[PDB]
Amino acid sequence: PQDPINIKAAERMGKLHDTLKLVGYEGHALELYLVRLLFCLFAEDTTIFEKSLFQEYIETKTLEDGSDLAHHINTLFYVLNTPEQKRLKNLDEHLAAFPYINGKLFEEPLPPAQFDKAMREALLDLCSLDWSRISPAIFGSLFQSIMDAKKRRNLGAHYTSEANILKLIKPLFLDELWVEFEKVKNNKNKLLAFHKKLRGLTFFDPACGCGNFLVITYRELRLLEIEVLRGLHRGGQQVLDIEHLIQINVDQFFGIEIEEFPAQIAQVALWLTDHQMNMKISDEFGNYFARIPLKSTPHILNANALQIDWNDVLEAKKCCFILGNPPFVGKSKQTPGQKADLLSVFGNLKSASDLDLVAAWYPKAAHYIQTNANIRCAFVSTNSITQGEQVSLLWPLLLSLGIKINFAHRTFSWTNEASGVAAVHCVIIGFGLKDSDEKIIYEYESINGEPLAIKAKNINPYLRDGVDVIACKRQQPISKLPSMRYGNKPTDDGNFLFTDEEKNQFITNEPSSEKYFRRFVGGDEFINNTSRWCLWLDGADISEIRAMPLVLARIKKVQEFRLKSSAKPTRQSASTPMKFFYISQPDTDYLLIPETSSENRQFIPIGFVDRNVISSNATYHIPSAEPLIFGLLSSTMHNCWMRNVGGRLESRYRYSASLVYNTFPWIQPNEKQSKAIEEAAFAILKARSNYPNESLAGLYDPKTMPSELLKAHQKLDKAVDSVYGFKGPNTEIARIAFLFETYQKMTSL
DNA sequence: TATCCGACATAAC
DNA sequence: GTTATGTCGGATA
Ligand SMILES: Nc1ncnc2c1ncn2[C@@H]1O[C@H](C[C@@H](N)CC[C@H](N)C(=O)O)[C@@H](O)[C@H]1O
Ligand SMILES: [Ca+2]
């Protein structure tokens, strides 16, 4: 038998596409030419064509140099559209063996292409594999393999695993369809009504890619529909009559896709799955049943789902489910076209440009279903739209429109079976206009593991079981606390930064420069006790900088890099090329908080730093911080706050003054409570000192953390918890919920 | 001025 | 290539 296809076959087929593209067979013809070939490869390996008829024809009626191949394929494409009654009586016997196929797939005449030896062999190469068991992974890898890395990233062109679609469609509709099936399966009447209900269901993916959500869904429906016909069978031991019993078909699936090639795959993907299932039902009940020629057609539109009215694809009143995996694009990574798309959907809302592109599909869906509250929706999305600065900008608008979250998958790692897996963490948000009396939140122990369904009273805009209050960005703290500041941002392409060895090479080469070096600490250098230096030129005497060539060359390298920038303020900054782009350095010693750091720690390692070391923008800091405040930011309570209202990078903690610290509710303490927290603070500090040559990473890894440090932190929480009057169960659940009662009491005043 | 963020970036097994 | 865990500067206000 022939080797079944794997991912390497789709990738090879993709190279055929780009090989054809490079000789000028471009555009619409190219996309449909290839998807036609795909159908032929599947067809000869099933019973649509006689076994291997396509391959044999190419091998016997086509020249080895590939010179004539495209002529014969062009006539083949015409035959497959010509019913047998309209074929020339003298048509080549070998060509006459091919069935009439028709359908939107073969109706358009196409310019003939041109092949050579290697393109012919590549296509015969594809023929020799078995296309019989073609799956989402194949359709997705093919879709992905024709795209530049920059394109793949920017359209979010990442196909969705079988597994990730199943976590989305099982709660959305599928599981309930199996419960309902099992309850009526023994009543011929109710089973008949159940079939008609299955036939009338429509599925709508407004960013459908290569169609996997539609393909998996249609396959599950076909599988269900087999057991339904098994049920209904009133002929006992006679062969079940499929053609007049079957109903479900591709005309129930609808999709929008901006690139034509995935929009063409999605269509053929649905027909191949159709035939795959027709063969499977033909096996169960032993009688041959195929839907050839292609009389039913999906409704995939090639368009821009953010610029059109979805009702042109599918009238809302005739629609049932909206599902899919829309593209993820950060606020500062999106092209002028997609920012404008984003802003069209959100109108004149404040800071709406700060949303991920994926957020755009939510108000669209929310406006679309306003005319039919029976629709239920679910979207994969980057977990970022449930964290930090975006929660305030997306969920006020969604809640105001009636949108209610009915189930949700919390953060998990992305993956699929194709090349170049993207590195992003995800959520799944099921929503609609009807509250559900049984909301489930699926939780993950291993970010890579399988989920566990947990009952939920309510589902937060953060996807938590709690109240619907959102923590908003603030420029100053709601509590009585000293202001916090952002570290200095260099924008220097590294020209002002050095390793110790570099600082030594540079000093010997330019000894007059020692006066201008100062210690440089980012988050990574501080957490890990690594040494780094910067040239600190804020307020340098120009008579001293003229003397020094090596420095002058750095200042010129900063300026040249800064002019090449694309952000006008950066270009502007090129004309002060010896000063950091943003400067915040204090005059007093300060408390440093790293910006981005491992979620595996129970506390964010913070600490005190000398006023002469320059802190990078990968950190925050409080100038002249009394020990009490170091206790407060060390506390479980603060870190629980940071964990819940802060943002994340994939999943690492990301601190930010305006989201965490400034919204942090904190009651001012007595003199005894204040002295207590100070005493624990010094106990933590001392506990750290007693371990030379341990970096803060080594000390705050909770595996390797010394018990003497854990105790001082336990001493500290007790003092801070006392200031709150917090007596509750000492869990992240009870602490989060209690801080939000405090936050709301303050935000109500 | 003043950032939050990254279908990530990249040094380390 | 996996695994572990934080840079750097854009875009916007
Ligand atoms: N404005 C847009 N309108 C319509 N489609 C878009 C738009 N932006 C990106 N896309 C497409 O969104 C898709 C995102 C993918 N994650 C979908 C893949 C698809 N779920 C699959 O399983 O294969 C890409 O295929 C894009 O071409
Ligand atoms: Ca074959």
Numbering used by the authors: 157 to 905
What does the primary publication say about this deposited structure?
MmeI was co-crystallized with a 29-mer DNA duplex containing a single MmeI recognition site (TCCGAC). The co-crystals were obtained in the presence of Sinefungin and diffracted to 2.6 Å resolution with synchrotron radiation. The final refined model consists of two MmeI molecules (residues 156–906), two 13-mer DNA duplexes (sense strand nucleotides 1–13 and antisense strand nucleotides 17–29), two Sinefungin molecules, two calcium ions, and a total of 61 solvent molecules. An N-terminal PD-(D/E)XK-type endonuclease domain (residues 1–155) connects to a γ-class N6-adenine DNA-methyltransferase domain (6mA-MTase; residues 301–620) via a multi-helical spacer (residues 156–300). These are followed by the TCCRAC-specific TRD (residues 621–825), and a final C-terminal helical bundle (residues 826–919). The endonuclease domain is disordered in the present structure, but its putative position—preceding the spacer—is in keeping with the ability of the enzyme to cleave DNA outside of the recognition sequence. The DNA is embedded between the TRD and the MTase domain with the adenine to be methylated (TCCGAC) flipped out of the DNA helix into the catalytic pocket of the MTase domain. The TRD makes contacts to the DNA bases primarily in the major groove, while the MTase domain makes several contacts to the DNA in the minor groove. The overall conformation of the DNA is B-DNA, but it is severely distorted at the juncture where the target adenine is flipped from the helix. To avoid catalysis and methyl transfer in our complexes, we crystallized MmeI in the presence of the AdoMet analog, Sinefungin, which has a nontransferable amino group in place of the methyl group.
